[PDB]
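Repro case for the chain-ordering regression, as requested:
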Amino acid sequence: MSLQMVTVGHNIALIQPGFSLMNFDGQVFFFGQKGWPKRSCPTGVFHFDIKQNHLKLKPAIFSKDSCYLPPLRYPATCSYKHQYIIHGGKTPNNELSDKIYIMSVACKNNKKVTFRCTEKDLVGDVPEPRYGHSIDVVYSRGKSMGVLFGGRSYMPSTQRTTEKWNSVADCLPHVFLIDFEFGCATSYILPELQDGLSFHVSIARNDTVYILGGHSLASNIRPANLYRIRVDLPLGTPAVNCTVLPGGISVSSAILTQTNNDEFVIVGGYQLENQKRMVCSLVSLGDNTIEISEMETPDWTSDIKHSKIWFGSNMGNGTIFLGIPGDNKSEAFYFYTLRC
Amino acid sequence: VLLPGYHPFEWQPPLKNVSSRTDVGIIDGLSGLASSVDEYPVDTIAKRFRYDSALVSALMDMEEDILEGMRSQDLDDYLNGPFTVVVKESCDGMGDVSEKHGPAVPEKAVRFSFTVMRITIEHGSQNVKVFEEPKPNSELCCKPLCLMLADESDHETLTAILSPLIAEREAMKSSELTLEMGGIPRTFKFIFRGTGYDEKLVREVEGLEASGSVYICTLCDTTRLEASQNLVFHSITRSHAENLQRYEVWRSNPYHESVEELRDRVKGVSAKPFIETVPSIDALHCDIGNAAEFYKIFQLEIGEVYKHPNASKEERKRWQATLDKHLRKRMNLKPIMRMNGNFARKLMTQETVDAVCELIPSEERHEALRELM
DNA sequence: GCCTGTCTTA
Ligand SMILES: [Mn+2]
Ligand SMILES: [Zn+2]
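-- result from build under test --
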C-alpha cells in the first residue's frame, strides 16, 4: 500500500467531507460538491482525473431526460449491474432527501461522457429521509433486490423543536428491501438488530450483505459487531434473516475498497471520538464465510497521524482518495491517494 | 430585566414546534447541530435568542414609548386592542473580524437582526400609528438576534444556523402574542418583512444566480439585454413561492430540456430558496445610476458622438479631461476615479448642465440635455 | 459570445 500526495486544480473548494466517487468503465467521477452548483458546472458532477499526482475536476453534462439532483452529503450509494444508486443524504440547505437517484452513462462520445440521472419514485414502506446509511444490491434466485439499513434523521415533526432543530437520531434498525423494477419498498424488523447504526460499512456478496462497525448515537458506542443479513427471494415472497458473527471490527466512517474478487480492504475511520483507526483490515469472502484479518499498516505521514479528522472515498481500482485539514498559513485540505 | 427571558408571555394558539418556556435567554446558535467526528465538521461558533422571546424583550423595552405614543394620539394608556408590529428583518456579513498582531487569517461574521419599524392599534376601522422608529437605519435600533462566526457565502452553515430562526418566525406568523404591559394584558400581531438583505444575500437565500448573471433583477425575470432594450415596462413578478416552484422545475426537469433551455425556463432559479425576502433599493443607488449615465452622456456630448460615430482612446480621454477640468473650474467639482454618492448628488443639478452646455456646439442638444435633467 | 476570485486603491 503506497501513499502519495495529490495536488488539486482551481476548483479544490468543491471537495468536502461526505462527497462520493463513482467509477464507470475505469473513469472516476465526483459528486456532492460543496454549495449549490454554479454556472461553471450546472450538474454538480465532475470528471475526477488524477494524472501524475495532480487532480483535475472537469465538469460533466447530463442528458436531456435527466434530473438535476441536488448535491448530497453522506448519501447511501451502491453499484448496480452498469448504474449507480444514490439514496438520501443532506442537501446544501441541510434538508434530508427521501428520493432515489440513478446515475448511468447515456452517451460516451470521443471520451466525453454524458450522464443520465433519473429519479425513482418509491411507494410502500418508504424509508424516512436519512444520511449515513447503507444500500447494496443482493442477487437471489435470479432476482435483484436492494437492501438499505441504518443512518440518522432529524426528529419527527411532532417532537422537533427549534431549540434543537438540528438534533439527529439513529433510524430504527429496519432492513428495507427495495425493488427498483417496480419502485416499491418493504420494511423488515429483525430481532438481531436491536440498536440503530450509522456510518457503518456494508459488503454485498450474492444474496448477503455484511454490516461492519458503525456508530450508535443512543449508546454513543462504536460496536465491535459483525452482522450477516441473508435475503432469499422465492417468487413474490421474500425472506430476510440475520445472524451475529463474532470477530467484528469496531469502526465508524471507515472506507472500503475492492482489491480482488472476494477480497476487500478496510482503511481509515474512527475507533474513538478522539482516536483514529490507523490500522487496516483485509476481508476475504467465502460463499458462507467471511474472514477479517489484520494487515500491515501503511506508512502514514506525521500530518495524517496527528490529524483529528480525515475523510475519503473509494476510487474503485483498489485506490482510496483521502483528505485531512490543515491550518497555519495553509491550504484548507490536503489530499492523498492510497493504492493497494 | 432588559435581556430576553425575563418577562412571561403566551402565544395563542401555541407556536408550532416552538417551546412554550419563557425563561430562555441566550441559546446555542447551532441548535443542537451534530458535532461528532463522523459528521460534517463544525467550524463556527454562534449564539442566538429565541425569536419570539427576543420579540417580547424588545416590546417590553419600548413599553414607555408605546404608552407615550398612544397618549400623544389621544388614546388611552389602558387600552389593549390588538397591536400590530411591523418587524423589519435583516442579515449581513461583517467582513473581517480578526484581531491580529502580515499573516492575517481572516475571520468573517454574520449578523441576523430585526428592527421594530412601527406599531399600530386598531381603533375603529382605523389603524392608529402609536409607534414609528425615528431612525430606522441606525445601529441603535437594530436588535441583534443571532451572531455567528461564519462566511455569508458558506451556504451549509448559513442554512444550518438560520433555519431554526426562520422556523420560529414562520410559527409566529400564525398566532397572537399576549403579554402584560403596565398591568394590562395586551395582544400583538406581527408582520415580518425581510428587507435588510443586500443583493448578494438576497440572491443567495432566494436561490438565484450570482450577480454577474444575465438575470439581473431580483424582482422580475428580465435579462440584461432585455432590460437594456426594454427600459421602463417591467413588473414585480418574482416571489418566494414562484422561486420554490422554479427550483422544483429545475430539479425534476419535467419537459426533458437541455441545460440552456431548462435555465431559460426557470429564469435562473437553480437552487432551492430558503428565506423569504423583500428586496428593495436604496435612495443612494437611484442617484448613483442616473449620475453614471449622465456623466457618460456629458463626455460623449463633448465629443459630438451624435455626429461622429468613431473615436480613438485619445479623443475620449481628452473629452473626459475637458469635462473634469471644466467641472473643477466652474462647479468646483473634484474629479473622481471611482463612482460614489455625493459626486452624483453634486453633479445631478441644472447648474452642471449649463456648465457642460458651455462645451457643446449645437443647442438642440442643449435643449435635449436640459430636458433629460 | 465567459467566470470568478484576487488585487488595487478610492
Ligand atoms: Mn453584505
Ligand atoms: Zn426588474
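Ordering looks correct now. The longest strand of chain B covers residues 108-122.
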